[PDB]
Structures are given as structure tokens and as C-alpha cells.
Amino acid sequence: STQGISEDLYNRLVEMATISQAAYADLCNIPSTIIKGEKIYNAQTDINGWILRDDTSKEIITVFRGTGSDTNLQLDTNYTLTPFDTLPQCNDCEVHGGYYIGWISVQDQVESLVKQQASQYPDYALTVTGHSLGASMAALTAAQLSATYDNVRLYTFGEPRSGNQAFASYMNDAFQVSSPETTQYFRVTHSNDGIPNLPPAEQGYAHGGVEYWSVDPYSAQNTFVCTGDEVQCCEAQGGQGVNDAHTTYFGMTSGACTW
Numbered sequence: 683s684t685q686g687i688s689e690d691l692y693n694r695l696v697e698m699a700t701i702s703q704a705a706y707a708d709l710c711n712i713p714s715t716i717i718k719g720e721k722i723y724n725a726q727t728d729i730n731g732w733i734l735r736d737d738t739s740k741e742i743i744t745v746f747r748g749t750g751s752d753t754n755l756q757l758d759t760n761y762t763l764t765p766f767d768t769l770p771q772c773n774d775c776e777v778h779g780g781y782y783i784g785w786i787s788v789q790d791q792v793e794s795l796v797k798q799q800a801s802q803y804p805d806y807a808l809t810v811t812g813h814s815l816g817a818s819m820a821a822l823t824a825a826q827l828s829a830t831y832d833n834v835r836l837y838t839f840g841e842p843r844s845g846n847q848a849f850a851s852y853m854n855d856a857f858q859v860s861s862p863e864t865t866q867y868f869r870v871t872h873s874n875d876g877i878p879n880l881p882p883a884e885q886g887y888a889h890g891g892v893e894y895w896s897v898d899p900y901s902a903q904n905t906f907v908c909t910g911d912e913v914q915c916c917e918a919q920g921g922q923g924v925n926d927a928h929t930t931y932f933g934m935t936s937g938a939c940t941w
């Protein structure tokens with residue numbers, strides 16, 4: 683769809699990409715405006731995340747790492763759709779089965795830690811982010827938080843299709859996706875990243891969010907804002923699986939700590 687984003691938005695996407703890619707390396711060199719809180723971890727699924735707080739921007743940030751282990755790779759491959767029973771009001775919503783196990787395996791930690799921060803800082807916004815598997819963790823987390831808190835924002839990078847169209851439509855409503863001027867769900871893709879094409883749509887999967895498609899060389903002026911139902915932006919490129927475009931967002935490779 684539309685060429686170019688503002689520098690303020692581009693900076694924000696870069697910031698969330700940095701946090702997402704740092705999650706692969708114990709949060710190396712994240713912005714100095716961020717206080718690191720408690721680690722989120724489950725041993726059966728190897729889901730890793732943290733709760734963070736940025737007082738300068740008045741947000742509580744929850745980040746999940748993406749795939750960093752054989753266990754994570756196993757989760758990635760479970761494409762069975764599972765009812766999103768977390769959110770009974772999400773009518774007919776179903777999510778990627780592996781990422782649902784991931785979500786369940788950390789839910790109590792996420793909800794308790796977010797609750798603790800939000801109780802103390804009740805005016806702060808809630809932001810969720812991650813890359814790849816971490817991006818789908820972020821989507822399911824942000825869905826849950828949106829049912830009980832105000833001002834939930836979701837920034838994903840290289841996100842798989844996280845669930846069915848019912849789930850996408852729920853997210854589109856909850857995150858004001860009907861305009862790029864109001865969206866609180868920024869689904870960031872890069873060049874021909876293959877992960878945003880999986881699971882295939884024809885298995886009953888769909889994306890939500892406004893897509894922000896980064897074309898190389900990366901910059902605000904070379905990022906596209908993609909909406910509606912046509913096959914376009916990243917998904918049109920037909921990338922296959924985990925490829926170079928998937929690993930490196932805004933010049934930052936997962937875990938590399940070059941920022």
C-alpha cells in the first residue's frame with residue numbers, strides 16, 4: 683500500500699525491534715530509558731521474556747524472545763488451531779497450537795507481573811513486543827491484556843500468522859487497526875521474510891494489525907504501510923521459511939548486540 687512513515691514512528695519501530703532482538707541475548711544494550719524487571723520463563727516450552735518499565739514514556743513493556751532452542755522450534759511447527767479459551771469473549775477465536783502452549787506455560791507469570799507493575803503505575807500504558815515466536819507470544823499476551831487494561835500496544839517483528847480470522851478481527855477491533863492513524867497494533871515485516879507467510883492462509887490462518895513493511899535499504903522513507911485484504915507487501919514476496927530477511931530487522935540481527 684502506502685510508501686513512507688514519519689521519523690517519530692520509524693524511531694519507535696526501531697526501538698521495539700531493538701528490544702525484541704536483544705531478548706535473544708539477555709537484553710544487551712536496550713535503551714537507557716528502560717528498567718529491567720523480572721524474567722519470564724518456563725522450562726517445558728523454553729519461553730523466555732521479561733517485564734520492563736520506561737518511565738520516560740510511561741509504559742510497561744513485556745518482551746518475548748523468539749526461537750532459540752530445539753524446544754522452541756517444536757512449538758513453531760504445531761499448526762493445529764486451538765480455541766483461545768483465555769479470552770471467552772473472543773468469539774470463535776482460535777490460535778496457533780504451539781504458541782498457545784507457549785502462552786499457557788507463562789500466562790500466570792505474565793499476568794501476575796504485569797498486574798504488579800500496572801497496580802503501581804496505573805497511568806502507564808502497556809506495550810508488548812517480540813520477534814518471530816516472540817511476536818506470536820506478544821500477540822496472544824496483548825490480546826489477553828486488552829480485555830482488562832487500557833492503552834495496550836503491540837509491536838511485532840517477523841510475526842507468523844498467530845491464529846484464525848476471528849482472532850485477527852478481534853485484534854483489529856481491540857487495537858483500532860481500521861486506520862494507520864489510530865492503530866495500536868504495528869505488525870512489522872521485512873523484505874521477503876518467509877515467517878509472515880506461515881502457517882499458510884489456506885490452513886485457516888490470518889494476520890491482523892497494520893503491516894509496516896521494511897524494504898531495503900531500511901529507512902522511514904522505504905517503509906510501507908499496508909492495509910486491507912489484497913496480497914501485498916511482505917506476503918507478496920513469497921519468501922520461504924527462516925531466511926536472511928527474517929533474522930535482521932532495521933539492520934539488527936537476533937542476539938547480535940551490534941546496536
Ligand SMILES: *[C@@H]1O[C@H](CO)[C@@H](O)[C@H](O)[C@H]1NC(C)=O
Nearest residue numbers: 760762764778779780782783
Ligand atoms: C498442538 O498444540 C495444542 C494446544 O494448542 C495441543 O493440544 C496439541 O496436542 C499439540 N500437538 C502436538 C502434536 O503436540
